[PDB]
Amino acid sequence: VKDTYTDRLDDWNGIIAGNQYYDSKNDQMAKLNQELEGKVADSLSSISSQADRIYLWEKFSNYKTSANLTATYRKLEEMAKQVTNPSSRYYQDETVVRTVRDSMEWMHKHVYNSEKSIVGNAADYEIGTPRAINNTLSLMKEYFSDEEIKKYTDVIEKFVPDPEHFRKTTDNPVKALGGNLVDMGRVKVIAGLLRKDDQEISSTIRSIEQVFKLVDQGEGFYQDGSYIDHTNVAYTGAYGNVLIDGLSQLLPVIQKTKNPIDKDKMQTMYHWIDKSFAPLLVNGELMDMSRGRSISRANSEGHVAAVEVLRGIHRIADMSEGETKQRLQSLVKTIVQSDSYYDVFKNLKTYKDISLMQSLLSDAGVASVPRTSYLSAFNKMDKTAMYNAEKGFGFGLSLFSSRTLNYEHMNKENKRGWYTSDGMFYLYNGDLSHYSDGYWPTVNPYKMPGTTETDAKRADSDTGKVLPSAFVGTSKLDDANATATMDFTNWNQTLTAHKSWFMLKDKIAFLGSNIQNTSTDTAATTIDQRKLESSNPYKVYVNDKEASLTEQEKDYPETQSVFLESSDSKKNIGYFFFKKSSISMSKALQKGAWKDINEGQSDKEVENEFLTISQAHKQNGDSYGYMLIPNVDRATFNQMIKELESSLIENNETLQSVYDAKQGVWGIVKYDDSVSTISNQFQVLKRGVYTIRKEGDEYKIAYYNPETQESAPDQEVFKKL
Ligand SMILES: CC(=O)N[C@@H]1[C@@H](O[C@@H]2O[C@H](C(=O)O)[C@@H](O[C@@H]3O[C@H](CO)[C@@H](O)[C@H](O[C@@H]4O[C@H](C(=O)O)[C@@H](O[C@@H]5O[C@H](CO)[C@@H](O)[C@H](O[C@@H]6O[C@H](C(=O)O)[C@H](O)[C@H](O)[C@H]6O)[C@H]5NC(C)=O)[C@H](O)[C@H]4O)[C@H]3NC(C)=O)[C@H](O)[C@H]2O)[C@H](O)[C@@H](CO)O[C@H]1O
16 A cells, blocks of 8 residues: 555665666666576576475575575565566566565565574574565565565564664673664664554664764774774774665665754765775775675675775765765765776666766766875774875775774684784785785785784684783874884784884885794794785895795895885885895795685685795894885885985884984884983983974974873973974
8 A cells, every 4th residue: 555655665676676777778787687687597496396395495494594594585585676677587477476475475484483583693683684574575565465564574573673772582682883773774764664654764763863973982983983893893894884885775765754864964974984984995995904704705805895885975975965976976986997906886786876886987077086195093993094196005004902803703704814903914006906816715814914923823713802902003193104003912922022113105114123922933024925916927136136936935134125026016015124134935826715714605725826025033022124115116116225224213122213304204102201312303202102294493293192092282292402
């Protein structure tokens, strides 16, 4: 029966499927329609038919694994899309309609109703299944009665009664916070419309609006652009995605209800985009260090996961106006055009999204200009992201602290993420595929790049830990220059290290002092473990003389430099050792399967070649010291190592410092309150992290106390001579 609720649901249909927009002459839309035709055909030839059955689809028959509830309903939802699309061969097909109806009823009676309790994992009962049911009913509302729609959604009201709290019917209720708050929103607003219920719509809206508050603790967005979820995990790039994805689908609907959303909170969303998401997006890639356990999914590599954010941003634009619409359109267009590696359209799954993207890409009013340089210090989630537009590389630094969990191993995903936050660094260069094409199941998880570790074996069943120390964070001076440290202790308290990083515009210095080991295991720092491309061989130099690398590890004592030379400058990698160091290197084929790291994934064998560089720490008090210099040619690299010969100022147990004489910049880490005099020009006074620039006779000063999470008045921490 038709009224304002179903007008709203027509708008929902246009957002979730978008059949009104479908155009058979449009190549990209036709491809999506063909994917759905094939899905519906496999479902239809597959389904159990005849006398009453124990399951609908065999491959999804164990109703005690809850992923099979939602997988089952998502098949019915595809049918619904195709049944209401005029260019589908299944358009108003009598078999598809009866099939969706008897299948809704079959599930209602044997698998998913109000007398059921949660078995397996709750997200299925409260979010995934509900959303699939809501979408099915809404697409197909003209084939169900109001009484049937109420029947099929009563279960949604049992598992999710409350605008606010999540899991309430279990023996362990909670606070739906962050992206689950938005996921609840999609569940409840839409059942709300479906059931013709005004209280449920308004109170669910009032309740989603709390997502717009900045927090000081726990889950949500922080004023420095960090995003936290699952209590203490850096999560912008998986749950932050869900929150932007989901809100951006709902808002055109929410804005036409009795209870629209004040347009001053739209300014908070724009801020999330600029402060939180945008710095994480590099050449079309969403940095893995922000994606938690999703890094272990073959179907969600970085460039794919990026699209979830981009389509959310592009939806926000379409409900904005004037200058802000155009600016967000350009943000999206410039990211999509930078990406020579992944085709955006492969993760646009409604016609309306395809349409919005096509028009943005071909509208010459919308500027596509290369992104400018930036440096975001996400102290509130212990991450840093840097990007240099001049030379064209990004850099990601994944830490953790007392305030945050190192890695997330949950629902059998991400089994070997042990060291992904132990000072691991990321380097985004001209190889856009680097962290993709099966990087995660093939990388050696004992040798994560930048980490100092022992070689003990680790168990997959292990879970994440916080760090004993709060002394972890980043002091940002400007968009080119920052410094960080991590007062590092390994997972079983046998190895330590003072690890520090000095971000100096076009290079990063890695310093480590106070390295101590009380285990019987050997210790080492992985300088690099880079995935190679057969199409692009590196020629390797050690001390500026060609080396030939093999499977077997070779030793290179008395090393000042290593240089990885490609035919493409934007893929070059130099390492300059301030003091001669004793290193080892190999190039080897590494194999593994995605199942090895995530129980739900394919067991099919994957392979990639990797080059590993490492430095052994045989004695207590050991030390490392080097400068990563990406994206320059060999002659330029040789010149810079001459410019930098006296750049190391100290690398010991209380003081770590690097000076860039060309910019006039110092990065400095102090572990105690002594008076350190630096380069005969000034003194620093307090334990903490410093980035300092000399401009003529004055000093610009960025000081950060990572433990208290506070800057400080200049005269407490600094004194000119
Ligand atoms: C152990 C325990 O009990 N611990 C509790 C803790 O519980 C845990 O909570 C988390 C959590 O959610 O925070 C759980 O995490 C989730 O686990 C599931 C397991 O299967 C993951 O799948 C899930 O990851 C998400 O899964 C979705 C899914 O497949 O259902 C993904 O779905 C897709 O998302 C798209 C994005 O918008 C969406 O578009 C798409 O639908 C289609 O969209 C179309 C469109 O474009 O419009 C179209 O037209 C279509 O019609 C429409 O179907 C949607 N579905 C599909 C099939 O594609 C989603 O993208 C993916 O991210 C994972 N969550 C995350 C964020 O990764 C964990 O498992 C629980 O154990 C409690 O939370 C805690 C208290 O707070 O206490 C602890 O003790």
